[PDB]
Amino acid sequence: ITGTSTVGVGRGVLGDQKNINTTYSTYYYLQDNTRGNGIFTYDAKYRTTLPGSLWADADNQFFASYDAPAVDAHYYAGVTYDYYKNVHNRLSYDGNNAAIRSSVHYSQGYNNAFWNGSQMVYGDGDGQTFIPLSGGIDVVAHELTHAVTDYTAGLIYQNESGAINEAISDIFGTLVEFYANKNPDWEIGEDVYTPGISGDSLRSMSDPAKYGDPDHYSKRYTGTQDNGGVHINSGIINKAAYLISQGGTHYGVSVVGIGRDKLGKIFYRALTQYLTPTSNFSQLRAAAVQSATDLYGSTSQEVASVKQAFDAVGVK
Ligand SMILES: [Ca+2]
Ligand SMILES: [Ca+2]
Ligand SMILES: [Ca+2]
Ligand SMILES: [Ca+2]
């Protein structure tokens, strides 16, 4: 909508106060004109028609509990925008400042969030397995990264290319979580998963097996569930990325860590210059090696670490 840019205030899913960029035209809308061609957040009003209506508020204050998922969807989309722009010189998910749209209050008791090809969508959770999923910055950045992948490598969401698609979203969601630097970790979804249970999460990159996901290629899932295990076999690649960044010895193979920023540069380059819709794990290894080679040289510590890491998870 046409209007003047303003700054509202409210509280997110976890009860934290933050400022949000809004637009004023009779009502205050969740429309941030400070980033790209805008960030727009919508109310799906517990139904499944999308996007729903652009979020409208009478006084520019968002402290109602109904407002909380919108506040965080809106704010964490801005943080994710900032990460890709400031760290990778990428302007929105399409690299041309496409408007970022999010809908919250999707359906009833819905224990998931996703990118639907055009926008991000967040359920409120059932209060058991999840609370409103936009409360997790790694989840918001995971979903926007699906859009980045879909505009770049185009990794098909099935089997190994689909597992890479998922790991790319967990990797950048995690790098965005560290970028915001609140309570960062190598876990996925901990801020919104199982409010009744502390210390857990949906997935772990540092130890995928903690939740039964494979941490070695020999343990890959080959069945048909979950599009061929996309959220399962992503742990093999998540582990490799964790190792590249943090180092460690895994099944007897030692990896010298090179840190999160170089992990991010290497995988960003691989994603945008070398991966294709059908890339498998072996081809991701080659893509990452070539990327580290371009960035740091064929004799670098960085290239040797990438090889050590894929070796440690059994990917040649
Ligand atoms: Ca209000
Ligand atoms: Ca965290
Ligand atoms: Ca996390
Ligand atoms: Ca929990």
- 94 labeled part of a ligand binding site: no
Q: What is the DSSP string of 207-261?
A: -GGGGT--SSGGG---SSHHHHHTTTTHHHHHHHHHHHHH-EEETTEEE----HH
Q: Give CA–CA dist 279/162, Å, rounded.
A: 9
Q: Is 88 considered catalytic here?
A: no
User: Domain 155-315, what architecture?
Assistant: Orthogonal Bundle (1.10)
- Partnered with residue 140 across adjacent β-strands are none
Q: Is 231 considered catalytic here?
A: yes
Buried b (16+ CB within 10 A) or exposed e, 207-216: bbeeeebbbb
What was the structure determination method?
Answer: X-ray
Q: Of these residues, 74, 143, 160, 250, which one is catalytic?
A: 143
Give the CB-side neighbour count of residue 269, counting CA atoms within 13 A: 17
Ligand with minimal distance to 187 CA: 3
Q: Give CA–CA dist 176/81, Å, rounded.
A: 10
Distance 29 CA to ligand 4 centre (A): 32
Q: Where are the domains positioned within the chain?
A: 6-154, 155-315
Distance 194 CA to ligand 2 centre (A): 14
Q: How many CB atoms lie within 10 A of CB 59?
A: 8
Helix, coil or strand: residue 60: coil
CATH 2.60.40.1930, applies to 6-154: no
Q: How many CB atoms lie within 10 A of CB 47?
A: 12
Cα angle vertex 267, ends 266, 271, to 5°? 125
Q: Of these residues, 88, 231, 250, 302, which one is catalytic?
A: 231
Alpha helices in the chain (DSSP H): 68-88, 137-151, 159-180, 225-229, 234-246, 260-269, 281-296, 301-312
